[PDB]
Design a protein around this ligand. Structure first.
Ligand SMILES: Nc1nc2c([nH]c(=O)n2[C@H]2C[C@H](O)[C@@H](COP(=O)(O)OP(=O)(O)OP(=O)(O)O)O2)c(=O)[nH]1
Ligand SMILES: [Mn+2]
Ligand SMILES: [Mn+2]
Ligand SMILES: [Mn+2]
Ligand SMILES: [Mn+2]
Ligand SMILES: [Mn+2]
Ligand SMILES: [Mn+2]
Ligand SMILES: [Mn+2]
Ligand SMILES: [Mn+2]
Ligand code: NA
Length: 326
DNA sequence: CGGCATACG
DNA sequence: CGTA
DNA sequence: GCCG
């Protein structure tokens, strides 16, 4: 059948129900904009279920028995199957509230709470925000200045270039340290909104203090347009033909003992990790995050040398990153 | 009905 | 509050 | 919104 947790089934990047999943994810997004995290989760999970199916849904009957499809999500699918559009979805798409909250929350440094307050205050455009910078954090000023570049898809060419310069700085910061590409590109995506890198060292403990040294070295190369420890949310200056563009890059450091858990978490998808942690706690009684896996009965952490170890600890069939596109 | 992942900056 |  |  179809299991109820996304981490129990392979989900490929491309699939056979793209239009149906896209529509449900509009409703999930809108639910988030209104603070309804429960409805967001259900709509996300229902969309993910369709991603995992082996063929296109053609008839409403094919939804019977599928987890996370109830009256609401099935009606969305029925309208799409019958009319090619779902009236609720189209109403969301063209609502001023949805459009403005999408524009605002996609600014680096702006979340749902900030976007909602700005919306209530009457603000609607990026130029509205730029007219009174005094109301902005340093992070939001950077997100607004570079917003256009940050809206341009990051390509694989860009990733190769960025990894080499990151490796150069990491190599000077700490000989022997390694750089691993994570995030959506590791799941096989050809584009991204940013690049994610996970940094470690084979000798436990030697990675301590590493990220400041890396950042200082990238800074003195003039590559850091913005940055603010274990996680650095940066904007890199990336060369382009006769120019350059700003690119969001995340750098994260973990000791080798935690590296499998950090690799798993930063490789995503977001829904996959939420479902994996939910499964861990509620089905296995184990607590999972990007640092480790904790047995609260025996008060001990599971040692893992690989992602494969973690799936085994959780009694789940192993899924390569390419099949974690929940 | 309660739950809905779980961290760091 | 923001970030992943 | 859906599940157990
Ligand atoms: N954006 C985000 N990522 C999260 C969260 N929680 C969590 O574990 N992650 C993990 C799973 C994500 O796939 C991974 C990388 O984050 P990301 O925003 O760069 O997403 P991504 O690489 O998959 O896709 P892209 O939008 O960057 O192209 O971090 C969260 O709340 N937000
Ligand atoms: Mn409804
Ligand atoms: Mn009809
Ligand atoms: Mn990413
Ligand atoms: Mn993104
Ligand atoms: Mn830590
Ligand atoms: Mn990222
Ligand atoms: Mn309730
Ligand atoms: Mn509800
Ligand atoms: Na944002």
């Amino acid at each position: 059948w179809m299991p109820a947790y996304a981490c129990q089934r392979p989900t490929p990047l491309t699939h056979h129900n793209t239009g149906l999943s896209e529509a449900l994810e509009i409703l999930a997004e809108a639910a988030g904009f209104e603070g309804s995290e429960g409805r967001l989760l259900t709509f996300c999970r229902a969309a993910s279920v369709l991603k995992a199916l082996p063929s296109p849904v053609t008839t409403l009957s094919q939804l019977q028995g599928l987890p996370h499809f109830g009256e609401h999500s099935s009606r969305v699918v029925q309208e799409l199957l019958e009319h090619g559009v779902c009236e609720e979805v189209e109403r969301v798409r063209r609502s001023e509230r949805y459009q403005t909250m999408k524009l605002f929350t996609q600014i680096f440094g702006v979340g749902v709470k900030t976007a909602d307050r700005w919306y209530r205050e009457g603000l609607r455009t990026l130029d509205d925000l730029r007219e009174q910078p005094q109301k902005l954090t340093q992070q939001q000023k950077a997100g607004l200045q570079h917003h256009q570049d940050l809206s341009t898809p990051v390509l694989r060419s860009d990733v190769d270039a960025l990894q080499q310069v990151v490796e150069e700085a990491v190599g000077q910061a700490l000989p022997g340290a390694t750089v691993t590409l994570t995030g959506g590109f590791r799941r096989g995506k050809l584009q991204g909104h940013d690049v994610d890198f996970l940094i470690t060292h084979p000798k436990e403990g030697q990675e301590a203090g590493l990220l400041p040294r890396v950042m200082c070295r990238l800074q003195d190369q003039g590559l850091i347009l913005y940055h603010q420890f274990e996680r650095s949310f940066c904007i890199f200056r990336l060369p382009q033909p006769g120019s350059w563009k700003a690119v969001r890059v995340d750098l994260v450091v973990a000791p080798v003992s935690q590296f499998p858990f950090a690799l798993l978490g930063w490789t995503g998808s977001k829904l996959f990790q939420r479902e994996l942690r939910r499964f861990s706690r509620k089905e296995k009684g184990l607590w999972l995050n990007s640092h480790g896996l904790f047995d609260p009965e025996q008060k001990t952490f599971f040692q893992a040398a690989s992602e494969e170890d973690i799936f085994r600890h959780l009694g789940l069939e192993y899924l390569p990153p390419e099949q974690r596109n929940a």
